[PDB]
């Protein structure tokens, strides 16, 4: 009696059992929620089926040095800050730059910044940060720099510490309604517990570097949701980091433009629908830089032709 009616029968038998995202088709456009979190980069949010990263949940953001995780965090914390939401930063690496944060939109002032000792201590006042109710969105830099009482003194595993924090955080992080960032680094540790705990883990690898007639002016990044509870995963985005400035929204807009039709080329020359932007992405993102009208509604024509 017809597998379609008898997967979808056991298929939702099994949602009851184990949340949502237990099971999946890459096609499903769904969705029946949201609380999410722009990430500042709209080909990220599409391709995270949800617009952004849902709140209330454990994220995991891995990479390379010098990739864009924590560009991407920032962002986060930028965009749940600038919408009345309170950002807790429990900085291990001392490694935050606030001229750069505060360069793309984060209320630096109002940022907690809990500097640990111990990767225990971190994720306690990380913890209780979350019970507070308060924060929206946490993130945590290293997943690495988070060693134990051990090891910072003088046998068992890093991860042991995670597993129970994590154990335990991810519980409360949930009915509080706080989405959590952990940055993981590149050594290619307690990042097996994280790996099965974080609801969307992102994966992000710096695919070329950026010129415009000068030389190193940012940075293009694919990001690849290689795990995603919320939405369907393996989907995958590229945007470009300028160097102290961010993701590029004007350049973003573009990719998008030509990808979904909206702008086009003929001589390089990109033009959206008549007027021209300029050839080669360089100059039509310097149009798009000062025009806010024209790229508003590209955002708009965009943002429509897609979920929500
Ligand atoms: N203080 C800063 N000032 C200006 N640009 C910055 C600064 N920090 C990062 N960037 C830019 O952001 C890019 C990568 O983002 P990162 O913050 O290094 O992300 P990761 O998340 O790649 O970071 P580690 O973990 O490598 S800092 C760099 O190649 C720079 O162009």
Redesign the pocket.
């Known amino acids: 009696p017809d597998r379609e009616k008898a997967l979808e029968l056991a298929m939702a038998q099994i949602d009851k059992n184990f949340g949502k995202g237990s099971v999946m088709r890459l096609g499903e456009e769904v969705r029946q929620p949201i609380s999410v979190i722009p990430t500042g980069s709209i080909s990220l949010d599409v391709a995270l089926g949800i617009g952004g990263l849902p709140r209330g949940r454990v994220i995991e953001i891995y990479?390379?040095?010098?990739?864009?995780?924590?560009?991407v965090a920032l962002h986060a914390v930028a965009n749940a800050q600038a919408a009345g939401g309170i950002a807790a930063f429990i900085d291990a690496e001392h490694?935050l730059?606030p001229?750069?944060a505060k360069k793309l939109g984060v209320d630096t002032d109002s940022l907690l910044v809990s500097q640990p000792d111990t990767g225990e201590q971190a994720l306690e006042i990380a913890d209780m940060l979350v019970r507070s109710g308060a924060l929206d969105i946490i993130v945590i830099d290293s997943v690495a720099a988070l060693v134990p009482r051990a090891e910072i003194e003088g046998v068992g595993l890093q991860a042991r510490l995670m597993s129970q924090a994590l154990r335990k955080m991810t519980g409360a992080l949930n009915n509080s309604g706080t989405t959590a960032i952990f940055?993981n680094?590149l050594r290619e540790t307690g990042g097996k517990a994280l790996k099965f705990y974080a609801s969307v883990r992102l994966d992000?690898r710096r695919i070329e570097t950026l010129k415009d007639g000068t030389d190193a002016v940012?940075?293009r990044t694919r990001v690849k949701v290689v795990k995603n509870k919320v939405s369907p995963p393996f989907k995958q985005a590229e945007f470009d980091?300028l160097?102290?400035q961010g993701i590029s929204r004007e350049g973003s807009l573009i990719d998008m433009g030509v990808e979904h039709g909206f702008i086009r080329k003929s001589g390089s020359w990109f033009t959206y629908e008549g007027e021209q932007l300029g050839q080669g992405k360089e100059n039509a993102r310097k149009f798009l830089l000062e025009n806010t009208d024209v790229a508003n509604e590209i955002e708009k024509k965009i943002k429509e032709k897609l979920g929500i």
Do not use: F, L, R
């Open positions: 990479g390379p040095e010098s990739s864009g995780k924590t560009t490694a730059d001229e750069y940055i680094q992000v940012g940075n980091i160097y102290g």
